């Protein structure tokens, strides 16, 4: 990508996207400290498209 793009991405505070996979980080098979609203979509029926 570019040094500028990566600097930008580090400055951006957005939660990490799923799809490869992060399903197990919603679940007990991942850190207990996860607090992502991204895993909470599984409860709401919300879907993040790629």
């Amino acid at each position: 990508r570019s040094a500028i793009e990566d600097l930008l991405f580090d400055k951006v505070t957005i939660a990490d996207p799923g799809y490869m996979q992060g399903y197990d980080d919603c679940m007990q098979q991942g850190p207990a400290s996860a607090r992502d609203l991204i895993c909470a979509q599984y409860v709401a029926g919300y879907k993040v498209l790629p």
Binding site: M20, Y23, M27, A32, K47
Partner: protein
Amino acid sequence: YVDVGPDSVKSACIEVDIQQTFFDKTWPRPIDVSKADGIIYPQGRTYSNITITYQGLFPYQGDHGDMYVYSAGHATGTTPQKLFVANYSQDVKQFANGFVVRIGAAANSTGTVIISPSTSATIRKIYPAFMLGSSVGNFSDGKMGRFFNHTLVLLPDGCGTLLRAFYCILEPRSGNHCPAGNSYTSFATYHTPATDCSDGNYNRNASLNSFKEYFNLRNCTFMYTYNITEDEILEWFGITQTAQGVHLFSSRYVDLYGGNMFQFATLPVYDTIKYYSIIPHSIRSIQSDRKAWAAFYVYKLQPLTFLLDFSVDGYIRRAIDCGFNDLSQLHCSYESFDVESGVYSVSSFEAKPSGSVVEQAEGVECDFSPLLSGTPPQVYNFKRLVFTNCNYNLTKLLSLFSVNDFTCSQISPAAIASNCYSSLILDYFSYPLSMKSDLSVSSAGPISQFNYKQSFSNPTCLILATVPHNLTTITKPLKYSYINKCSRFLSDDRTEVPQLVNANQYSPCVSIVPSTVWEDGDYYRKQLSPLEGGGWLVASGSTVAMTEQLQMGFGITVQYGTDTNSVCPKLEFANDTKIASQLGNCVEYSLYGVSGRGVFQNCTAVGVRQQRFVYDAYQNLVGYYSDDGNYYCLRACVSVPVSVIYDKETKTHATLFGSVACEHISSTMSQYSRSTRSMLKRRDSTYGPLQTPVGCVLGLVNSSLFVEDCKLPLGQSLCALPDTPS
């Protein structure tokens, strides 16, 4: 009653032998909804070639049904013998909001005789017979399927051209091989074509007489007959029950070729059908003259939504069960039989959660013994019990009094006994039944104005009851009594202002009023000090005569806390399994009466201790400090989104499970997002799941082709290229 015709002559019956192992066949018939199989036409309306959606009772599309085959009985040589029959008489079924059938479906084909199957006779249509009713039970010989009181009877009689129906009481017969006899085996009916069904005089009573041979008609309340003509073409028929009585439907009456069923007839009977069975029958024909009969099928009705493809002639020609597949759901979403190609979201998997575990109690039994003695208070003298930390069985408490009124608000009357809470609160008082119009949570009576009020922030119940003559420790007031006034006079002695009672609290006038009201209309007054703001307190009351057995009232309310929920019903945990760990599926739970469902993880701890439950900003439980000294975190549960890839040009499809990972996927699954996924399995029964950068998929095959316009992009660099074009 109904003119039943002549009484059966023989007390005796033809012997009936069960030959059921001969009757297995592998001729299942799934519903083809695209042929409109099993569709009941809507009542009182018709439509043009526009298509609609509709909900009503229908068979499930994937159901192959239950199949039965009628057969010839025992005969040998040149004569009729014993009734060799199937064991269908014992097949009692729960009624399931009606059913539909196929009749003659195997006609103009061949099969076997079954009882003497080596003959391989061609098969022909035969009409089915049925019995329905509100109750079933054992025959005096312990045999299955006896019916009680009045029952429905439906049977063709003699030739299929006559149909009869009845609502009657069966009468058992004491002869050899008959229902009251102890030589009874099983009920059966028969036809004897060697003398029955003459072409100059069909025997209209043939099957009625063989029916009567085992059960005499008695007390019959309804009878009907119908005219039919022969037709080997498959017929659809069915029966349902409504608040307007039982109704009959057939395709024969209106739609001989399309198979749509119309309501042919109705019945006056309002007795609910709780049970259903098929009546066995046999043909008495001679061993060299035997004829095989076509298979019979039945399907249970269900309250399902369907697309309906009406024709310009108003027949439904095609239909789609919305619930059958996610593909069917897609069609129902667009109200059409041809959705445009694309990728579309469909509902998520439910994730198959585990059966429940609990953390409720330890605690002691709730001491409800104060209720066992003394005189209960006048309504302004209330006595209260409040329970914490304890276990109970209120039905044992209830057994000690006779309750003449049990009602509740904001809680079912059953649930107040079964729910776990931070507290259980009971108020009790003496109360004659003569005053009962004034005891409700909404009452405008003087009892609620000045003696009691109940908050609506807590669920509550009310009990009116009386004391049994064997409760000698219970005692009663000289008269029942209450305060009917409680106000303060203004210091200038003209104006006066009422003091209504506070919810769940004693009225202020209790400080001047005597423990009972000595006489009806007694009143008292108190001058008030300048420290009290002046004026005169004034109060008065009324009485009701005492009764032979004490009458009582109770108010009951509950409080839900968070970490204080130690009052629960006595545990049912004995004879179960170790709790609460599974870890494991996202198991249903109750912890100290806090219901929920979710999965736990044995992680560290966060403050603060002894609050038990931990919550987020959205009021969702985060975790719990276990009394095994480990904090467990709660992740509630997860679900798996599903989407489909549909190429209508080839009419083919594939699916995507997103981020679930193929480590949690297998060729079949049960979580579940749909009752079946067999449409994918049509090709994917032979393939493993494939992981992709967007997600785990089925049926997409890694061809590694490069195409600049996929027409079904999956996002990123992914492509759902179609199988080679139409």
